[PDB]
Design a protein around this nucleic acid. Structure first.
Ligand SMILES: CO[C@H]1[C@@H](O)[C@H](O)[C@H](OC[C@@]23C[C@@H]4[C@H](C)CC[C@H]4[C@@]4(C=O)C[C@@H]2C[C@H](C(C)C)[C@@]34C(=O)O)O[C@@H]1C
Ligand SMILES: Nc1nc2c(ncn2[C@@H]2O[C@H](COP(=O)(O)OP(=O)(O)O)[C@@H](O)[C@H]2O)c(=O)[nH]1
Ligand SMILES: [Mg+2]
Lengths: 52, 94, 841, 89
RNA sequence: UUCAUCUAGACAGCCGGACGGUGGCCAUGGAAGUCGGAAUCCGCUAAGGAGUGUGUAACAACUCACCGGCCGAAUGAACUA
């Protein structure tokens, strides 16, 4: 219904992120600095909790 | 032989089973060792060993996957001891 | 067709003219709606009436709620030509055929009606989907009928919603239904027996179909393979062979070639979607967009009848009218059933054996095997079929080899009756032979070998399920199976104590209306109920509130009870006295290892055996001193439990007369326990000193009661206060594609796994696990949700292991439970210590 | 020589294979479903009943494709650390 | 502000492999580099840590690592204001 390797490129958008531990914001897989200032720039990022 | 972390390869010809074991580091530490290093030890942890053995684990290294591709006894001058917390032999290993 | 009993028993007389099977599935895959269209097409009815539409006449109050719980084999009238029967490998003859087809609700957690419908038929109708294929639950019901030995028939249903609510593409829809085949090549290759050999179903021989319920359309490969075999000049069996795999006809080179490549490299589209699905695809855009550019004119290119009220409608309701006409309901369905799904006579050639078990080449066994319809009557009610006549219960059974009549005094035996007894062997005269019809039953008179029907007035003595034998040497069949095993528990006791007699009557009535159910009593004192699934249980419970019992019933989370044990030896010899301060009993409490304490409750060491020969057992091999065993007085609780009383004294000259006084007080003490209020386990008393004062006016009865009481009361507190918690045994069978999901359940819900094993190369594993009594209240849900319904928990009560916390400690596990246990009584809220129970000068 | 192979890095030659038995017990064929190839069972043993032209010679290889080709013992990086420059006495 | 790696050849970064003894000592229902704790070595080269994480039921496999081609030549560790 989505092909294994075709569903792999679908993750490169809504899966391979990094959730801010105070903003939640959707950012890059190797990014370590926030892009909004509702925190005034921070580095507290845990590669977004994907599926199991 | 060896009953804890011992690799066992089963090669069969459609109902004609032949036995061949990789003789892991676990198999050899019990291979030449006496009774307190062979049976009666399950509730009592095995972390005992120091006594020298010599060139006899040179032939025992010919049973532990020869995929190291170098010099047998010179490689175990490290393997048996730092990974083998049972037997210290000639204090030149660590 | 409107028949009469003679027309029924007419096709019943014909053994090879009956289709004994049910319906294997993967939940709501158009099974109930499939059978409704079959009565509307040509389903045999009674001596009058005319009822055709959809649901209603198959389900009742199940119609207002929404489910199918009545799985009966409604026999129908088939009209199979003599040319079809020309290659059927059966001894069948005629035009008027019979169809003994059962409903059977597919999904898991209800594999009760599922395993009981398999125990009364030679095959089954599997219903897989286009939007699902061959998944987990069909894997369940399919591998289930294979470890039972049945004939498989596929119907990729809802190809209607696969081209309307979605819509697929030509050759891509090839691998869609070809992948449902590659998924069937997986279940067959492992769970199919060597007794049937090559049985992987291929619609390349007309084994897999194509249909939809609200469309009234039923398609079989053989349908257009035969209505086109002649219009091509090709063999009938070789035309459907060049329709799967290397099948590319060229409307240019005009040849059925193997390779689709030409002298350039250009392809060739499938002749199956070129002569069978090509114009079939034209029927799609035909009514979907209303293209009268083909519609009626294309109707002649396909050979269809256009009648008045047909074009009198519009839209999708219009496409359903030509779907039931291009591929008619009863026509194509009864087609493959009367084709590769046999009659008891020709299919029992392998089924007969695993049916009747116990005796190798038994006498009645060879009769059931070759099938003799007038020999010694071999019947087995796989699960009674009670109705709604104020408690009018019937019996659902398979008449293997033999005839049954109205008023026959047969030996109605039970799974407890084995040749050398009379237990459950209630040889009673049957009042009348019943003939069930889909959802209702009417009065008939007799039936032979290879039939499916019921009996009445047997309910009065037959409990659960029963085998009907007229021959005494008759053993019985295999006691069902159930790889599901009930794993639900509830404190289903009276909400209104005035009608408790109604609850126990209906508890058996639940067993009466269920394939597998545990309606026992609690070891605490309440009425415990155990079901298959949560969904399952829930249903049978409201049914227990309306008719089965009929009045307010309060269900509560399964009230528990454990054992009161000791850890180390008693700290000091506990001295005791009477409310007189006269008689003084001094003793201690010692540890009984599993093998010897469990051996007490086993019967190896029992009071109803002389203390001389019982002392020999213990002394000689086990290792229990001879004088200590010839001194064991009482086995608390009552008189056979693992809480002994071994006397190790020497003085007190009046000990011999009030020996039973110490013994009887102790049976009363271990029964109504010290730490909370239940019974102990593995604690044997060692009485060392005692004092006998004045006459028996002070030596016995109640003067001696508060004595032996505070005696072991103080001793249990000194022998180390601990508890042995009740361990459960569950062996979950689940696919390797979900082994670590159950392992997650273990590293969480106390993984005391006895050991993990199975069969290297097969799907489902044999997961042996030790699990607490309470660590199992909802265990069913977590197991299947952890790794799909692929998990199958085998329940039963096991042993008692070491419990970490301490009883007298209010915040730790043990103590918190005990403090909550005393509020369960409705009194005292504390743990009284042995300090306020020890004796001094 | 010797050098077996790697997955999902290069798609060099056209992926071709014959149609006989592999002899493996039924298991990794749930992915052979969702993928789309003409398979069947030869009395239990997993048998390919057709010579398949899987993927092309010049595209992005991956996880799903390497699973079925690594079970066939196929090694596309058929090469071996060899020579470059030459010098003698 | 102290501290490194290098221009006849560094970084971030683009590309290729990822060794065995080893399914290491035990502990195991089950832990083969990746629940746990202690050992934390050399045979050999450019190199591969009893292994960075993911993911396995455990394997497997991906992959940080260490090592070669491309990198313009610098900016990385770390805090001060
Ligand atoms: C054959 O079906 C069996 C198995 O499912 C299993 O043996 C099950 O065990 C029930 C319990 C049995 C325990 C022993 C026999 C002593 C203590 C009893 C229990 C109460 O604490 C523990 C388990 C769970 C039940 C609590 C919840 C009241 C028991 C009971 O019958 O009361 O019983 C049914 C009838
Ligand atoms: N249109 C359409 N509806 C369906 C089909 N199958 C099931 N349904 C719907 O599902 C409802 C009940 O189905 P049910 O009898 O539970 O299916 P079963 O559990 O397999 O017997 C019907 O009222 C339909 O509306 C189908 O093939 N086509
Ligand atoms: Mg239904």
């Amino acid at each position: 219904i989505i092909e294994p390797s075709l569903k792999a490129l679908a993750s490169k958008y809504n899966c391979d992120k990094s959730v801010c531990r105070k903003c939640y914001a959707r950012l890059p897989p190797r990014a370590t600095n926030c892009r909004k200032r509702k925190c005034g720039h921070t580095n507290q990022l845990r590669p977004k909790k994907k599926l199991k | 032989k060896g009953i804890k972390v011992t690799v066992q390869l089963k090669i069969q010809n459609r109902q004609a089973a032949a036995s061949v074991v990789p003789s892991a580091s676990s198999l050899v530490i019990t291979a030449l060792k006496e009774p307190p290093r062979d049976r009666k030890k399950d509730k009592n942890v095995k972390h005992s060993g120091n006594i020298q053995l010599d060139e006899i684990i040179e032939i025992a290294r010919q049973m532990r996957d020869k995929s190291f591709g170098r010099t047998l006894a010179s490689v175990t001058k490290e393997i048996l001891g730092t990974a083998q917390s049972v037997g210290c032999r000639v204090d030149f290993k660590n | 067709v409107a028949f009469t009993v003679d027309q029924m028993r007419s096709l019943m007389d014909k053994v090879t003219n009956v289709r004994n099977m049910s319906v294997i599935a993967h939940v709501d895959h158009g099974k109930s709606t499939l059978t409704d269209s079959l009565v509307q097409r040509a389903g045999i009815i009674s001596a009058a009436k005319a009822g055709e539409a959809r649901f209603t006449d198959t389900r009742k109050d199940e119609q207002e709620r929404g489910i199918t719980i009545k799985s009966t084999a409604i026999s129908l009238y088939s009209e199979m030509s003599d040319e079809d029967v020309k290659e059927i490998k059966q001894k069948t003859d005629g035009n008027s055929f019979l169809i003994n087809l059962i409903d059977s609700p597919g999904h898991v957690d209800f594999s009760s009606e599922v395993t009981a419908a398999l125990r009364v038929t030679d095959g089954a109708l599997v219903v897989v989907d286009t939007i699902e294929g061959v998944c987990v639950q069909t894997e369940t019901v399919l591998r289930q009928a294979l470890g039972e030995r049945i004939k498989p028939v596929v119907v990729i249903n809802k190809v209607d919603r696969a081209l309307l609510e979605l819509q697929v593409s030509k050759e891509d829809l090839y691998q869609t239904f070809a992948r449902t085949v590659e998924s069937v090549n997986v279940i067959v290759s492992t769970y199919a027996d060597e007794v049937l050999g090559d049985v992987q179903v291929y619609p390349a021989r007309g084994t897999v179909a194509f249909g939809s319920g609200l469309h009234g359309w039923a398609f079989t490969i053989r349908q257009f393979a035969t209505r086109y075999a002649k219009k091509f000049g090709v063999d009938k069996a070789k035309m459907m062979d060049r329709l799967w795999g290397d099948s590319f006809f060229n409307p240019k080179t005009k040849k059925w070639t193997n390779k689709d490549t030409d002298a350039e490299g250009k392809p060739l589209e499938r002749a199956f979607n070129m002569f069978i699905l090509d114009p079939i695809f034209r029927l799609f855009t035909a009514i979907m967009n209303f293209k009268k550019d083909e519609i009626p004119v294309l109707l002649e290119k396909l050979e269809i009848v256009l009648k008045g009220d047909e074009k009198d409608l519009e839209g999708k309701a219009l496409l359903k009218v030509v779907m039931r006409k291009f591929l008619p309901a009863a026509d194509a369905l009864l087609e493959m059933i009367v084709l590769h799904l046999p009659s008891p006579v020709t299919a029992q050639a392998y089924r007969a054996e695993q049916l009747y078990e116990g005796p190798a080449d038994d006498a009645n066994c060879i009769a059931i095997k070759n099938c003799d319809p007038k020999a010694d009557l071999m019947l087995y009610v796989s699960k009674m079929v009670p109705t709604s006549d104020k408690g009018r219960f019937y019996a659902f059974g398979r008449v293997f080899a033999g005839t049954v009549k109205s008023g026959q005094k047969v030996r109605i035996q039970g799974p407890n009756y084995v040749p050398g007894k009379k237990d459950d062997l209630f040889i009673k005269a049957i009042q009348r032979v019943v003939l069930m019809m889909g959802r209702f039953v009417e009065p008939i008179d007799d039936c032979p070998a290879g039939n499916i029907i019921g009996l009445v007035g047997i309910d009065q003595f037959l409990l659960k399920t029963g085998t009907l034998t007229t021959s005494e040497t008759a053993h019985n069949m295999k006691v069902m199976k159930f790889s599901v095993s009930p794993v639900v528990q509830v404190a289903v006791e009276v909400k209104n104590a005035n009608d408790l007699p109604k609850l126990v009557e209906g508890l058996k009535r639940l067993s009466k209306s269920d394939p597998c159910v545990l309606t026992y009593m609690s070891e605490s004192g309440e009425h415990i109920v155990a079901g298959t699934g949560e969904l399952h249980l829930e249903i049978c419970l409201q049914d227990l509130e309306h008719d089965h019992a009929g009045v307010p019933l309060k269900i509560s989370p399964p009230v528990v009870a454990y054992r009161e044990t000791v850890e180390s030896e008693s700290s000091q010899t506990a001295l005791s006295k009477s409310p007189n301060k006269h008689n003084r009993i001094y003793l201690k409490a010692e540890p009984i290892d599993e093998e010897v304490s469990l051996a007490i409750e086993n019967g190896i060491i029992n009071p109803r055996d002389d203390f001389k020969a019982r002392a020999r057992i213990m002394a000689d091999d086990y290792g229990w001193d001879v004088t200590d065993a010839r001194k064991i007085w009482c086995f608390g609780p009552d008189g056979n439990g693992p809480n002994l009383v071994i006397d190790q004294t020497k003085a007190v000259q009046y000990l011999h007369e009030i020996k039973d006084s110490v013994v009887a007080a102790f049976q009363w003490a271990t029964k109504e326990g010290p730490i909370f209020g239940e019974e102990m386990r593995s604690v044997r008393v060692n009485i060392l000193d005692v004092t006998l004062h004045a006459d028996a006016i002070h030596r016995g009865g109640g003067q001696i009661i508060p004595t032996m009481r505070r005696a072991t009361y103080a001793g249990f507190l000194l022998a180390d206060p601990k508890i042995q918690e009740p361990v459960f045994l569950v062996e979950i069978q689940c696919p390797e594609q979900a082994v670590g999901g159950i392992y997650s359940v273990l590293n969480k819900k106390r993984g005391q796994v006895v050991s993990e094993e199975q069969r290297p190369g097969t799907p489902l594993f044999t997961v042996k696990a030790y699990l607490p009594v309470n660590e199992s209240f909802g265990f069913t849900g977590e197991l299947r949700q952890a790794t799909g319904g692929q998990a199958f928990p085998q329940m039963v009560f096991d042993h008692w292991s070491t419990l970490g916390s301490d009883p007298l400690d209010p915040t730790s596990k043990a103590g918190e439970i005990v403090l909550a246990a005393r509020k369960r009584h409705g009194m005292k809220e504390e743990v009284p210590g042995w300090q306020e129970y020890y004796d001094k000068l | 020589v010797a050098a077996p192979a790697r997955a999902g890095a290069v798609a060099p030659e056209d992926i071709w294979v014959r149609a006989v038995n592999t002899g493996m017990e039924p298991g990794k064929t749930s992915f052979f479903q969702a993928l789309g190839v003409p398979t069947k069972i030869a009395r239990g043993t997993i048998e390919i009943v057709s010579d398949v032209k899987v993927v092309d010679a010049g595209n992005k290889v991956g996880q799903s494709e390497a699973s079925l080709l690594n079970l066939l013992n196929i090694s596309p990086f058929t090469f071996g650390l060899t020579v470059v420059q030459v010098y003698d006495n």
